[PDB]
Structures are given as structure tokens and as C-alpha cells.
Fold this sequence. Notes:
Blueprint: E1 7-10, H1 47-52, H2 54-58, E2 64-67, E3 71-73, E4 78-80, E5 83-85, E6 93-99, H3 106-118, E7 122-127, E8 131-134, E9 148-150, E10 153-156, H4 178-183, E11 189-191, H5 197-212, E12 217-220, H6 228-241, E13 246-249, H7 261-270, E14 274-275, H8 278-289, H9 294-307, E15 315-316, H10 326-329, H11 333-344, E16 349-353, H12 384-398, H13 401-404, E17 406-412, E18 416-423, E19 426-433, E20 438-445, E21 450-452, E22 465-468, E23 474-481, E24 485-490
Parallel strand pairs: 1-2, 1-16, 2-7, 7-12, 12-13, 13-14, 15-16
Antiparallel strand pairs: 3-6, 4-5, 8-11, 9-10, 17-18, 18-19, 19-24, 20-23, 21-22, 22-23
The structure holds calcium ion (3 copies).
Amino acid sequence: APKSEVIYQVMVDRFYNGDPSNDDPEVSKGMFDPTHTNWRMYWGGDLKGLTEKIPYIKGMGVTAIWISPVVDNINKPAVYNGEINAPYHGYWARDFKRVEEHFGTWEDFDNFVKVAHENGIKVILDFAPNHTSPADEENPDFAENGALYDDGKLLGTYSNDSLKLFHHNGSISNWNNLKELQDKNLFDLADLDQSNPIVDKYLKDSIKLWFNHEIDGVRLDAAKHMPMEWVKSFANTIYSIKKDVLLFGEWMLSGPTDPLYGYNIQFANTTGFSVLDFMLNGAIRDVFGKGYGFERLNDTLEDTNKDYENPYKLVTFIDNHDMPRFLSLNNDKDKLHEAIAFIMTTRGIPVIYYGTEQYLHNDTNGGNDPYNRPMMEKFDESTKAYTLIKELSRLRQLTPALQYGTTTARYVSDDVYIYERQYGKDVVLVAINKGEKTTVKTVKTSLRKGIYKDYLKGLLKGVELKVTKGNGENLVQDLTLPGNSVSVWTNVRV
Ligand SMILES: [Ca+2]
Ligand SMILES: [Ca+2]
Ligand SMILES: [Ca+2]
């Protein structure tokens, strides 16, 4: 009876500024905007602040915090056309053995792990071993020239790479060619050569250090840009040091016909990392954000459940830091609530991107990066979305049917989706109406006959269920779903 998880993804610089003294550190000064109007500067969020907000996060039923990368990032900005770009997001590492000084010290990090563990919450580290930082081999004064440091000891720069640390093969151009995706630079990011035994032992020593500070898992950045066999050895290293670790990779897919989807599946089946579920994500945004009909969602769900060997390890999401937030895509809270309810009641592990529960969004430039990383504003624990996210996790803890159960579609139309989750004798039936009020024909269900109250207590306009005994499969009768509603029914005792 495995444990069910719920992930909250935090971008540390944009979550909560707990400590003004690390806003503009001496060693890396000039990259802080206190006004939060230059969207590519550090804004001050830090580990102290994240720690103070763990009760808020725990009040949402979150079981694991995916924290954006907190290794030391470059101490000079990347300047493009006079535009200061700070590594406020954490993906431009200079030193994988040190904590980013804008975010805190080792003591602040250890305190964050301690308080998270005090509240029953796993810490999942976003780790980006594909690369260091932006570099121009012909201009060492640009940014930090992709420098790699080992706990303060310089191992090399891109323009002076004595130890053969990096690939010097230009940038990625043919994005459908695997070898090009692995051996060239992701944009201008100095690409690490994990085949170099120096780099191999460095990256593996680094992740050992972080686990010595009691992290519980890894979200693996840019997983398609590294050789799959090295990523497999990397997971073996982590498994060698800790038994129950949550490992999943960001293997980005462009859409349903992405030519590389087969390597993604292969990655998730063999490396020991599962994947973030981009196929399901696109279907979610299509049907809830673009008005497509539910059969696109159920078809995608059915395909993924066969395509992946272990689909209950998939990590599901509605949005993230690399695409417009759902409300930028479609500013409809009812549709957001329904999407949240969906991933909460679908197989695998759902992610809530920070601030979703506060309807946080900025729609400049379509809501695209950097505008999908706004600063957290209110921490209101009474919003309907906060309440929704808090309640469905309770059911995931009462039954494995949500994360680990089979999936049976009971009714699929353009605007109505009824699906059933089963684990042993546990049954959860869910009905989503993203259209107007309607009354459904006759639905099968394995729920015993009787009347079921909405598990959500009408929070999303949910109704009762009325099951008659069919002999064989039972019969749902006279199900009138209000418009823009979600109902959840179960035989699991509450
Ligand atoms: Ca700060
Ligand atoms: Ca730094
Ligand atoms: Ca690479």
C-alpha cells in the first residue's frame, strides 16, 4: 500500500522574502530589484521565507515541496543588449557544492529541510547537471563564461577549459536529433560533458552532498539533453545512498505528435527517473483552456496509461515556470478548479505551481517567462482553490485508488467527463461538467447501490449520486450536473 504524494513547486526567489540581508549580497551585487518591476532580476525570495511559509503549504495537504535549484548560481549577470539577466531562477549554476547566497546559507537550507520534515513534507531538489551558465567562448567577459567551481575551487571556464569539462560543439539547431540535443549547448548554456570522468565524479559527488543534507528526491532539469545511460547511472548513484527517493525528469515534449515521445517513454521506463507528464498536460490545457472536448483528454489519458510501464509514477501538472500559467491561457477560475480537481483524482503525482491557489498570474507577453514567475502576493488560506487543493489530498491519503488505481471512463462527451478509479474494493467516481447544466443518460459504475454524497460538499457545485442495482455493473440514474461543476463520490469511509 504505497504512499500517495502531492507536490508544491516553488520558485524560491519569487515565493517569499524572509531575509532582507541576502537580497543584494556583496559577492554578487547589482542583481536585485526591490521594486519587482525588472522581471529578470532577483526579487528577494529566499530559504528563510520559504521556511516561514511551510505551515501555509502544509495547510494545503502538500506532501512534498519541489524547490527550484538552490545551488550557487553565477555572481555576475548575463547581459544581452544591455539587459541585465540575473540567474534568479536558479538554472545557471556556478558551483554545485554551495548554496546560493541570495537564498541563504547551509544553515538556512538545513533549517528548511528540518521544518519541512517536521511537517511530514519531502524536499525535492530541482537539479540541473546538464550545464552551468550562459557563455560565449569568444568573450570571457560575458556573464561568468560558464565557469564551474568545486566548493569555491575553479575547475574551468568555457574559454579556458583545461580539464575538458564542456562540449565545444556550438548550440542546438536540429532539435529532433538526439545526439545534437545531448552534445550541443542548450541555447548559450555551457554544456557539461558527463563522459569526462572529472565531470562524472563531480556531479555524483554533488548530489551525494545534497542528500547528506537530507533531501528526498530530484526533479531532473533538461533530462532530454543528457545521454540516457548517464542519467541511468546518476539515478543508480542516488538509489545507492537512499531507499525511498522521488525521482522524476523534465523531458520536454512539444505536443501530441512530438517525434521524440518514444525516447521519453524509454527514459521513464528504464532510467529510474519517471517524467513530468507533458502529454497529459497538453490535453488538460486543450480541454480546460482552449475549449476542446473531453475525448481529447480521455484519449490521452488512455494512451499514456498503456504507453508508460508505470504510469502511477507520472508527475502531472497544469502549468509551470516555462509556459503561461493556466489563467493567462484562459482566465476562468471555474475551469482552473476543474483542472485541479482532475489532476488530483488522476493517476500519478500532481503538482501545484506556487500561487495557483491564489489565482496569481501576469498576462504580459502572453504570460510567458518571466511573467509566469510573479511574486507571491497574499497567502489567503480561505480561497476556494486553496480549499479545493486541501480537500482532495485528504482523499488521496484515505485511498490508493487516486494515485495507483485503474482508470475506467464511464461517460465522455464534449463537456462532460465521468471516470472511475479503483484499487481493490476502493472506488472513486468523479464527474466534471465544464459546460452548462445537463442531465446524463445511464452510466455504469461499480459503486454499490444507494445514494452517495459529494465528497467535496458542493464546493464546486457538486451533487449527490444515486445508484440502482443493475445485477452485474450498477446503474447511475438521473445525474443532473450543474454547469461548471465537479462531483466526487466514493465508498471509501471518510
Ligand atoms: Ca532575501
Ligand atoms: Ca551566487
Ligand atoms: Ca548535454
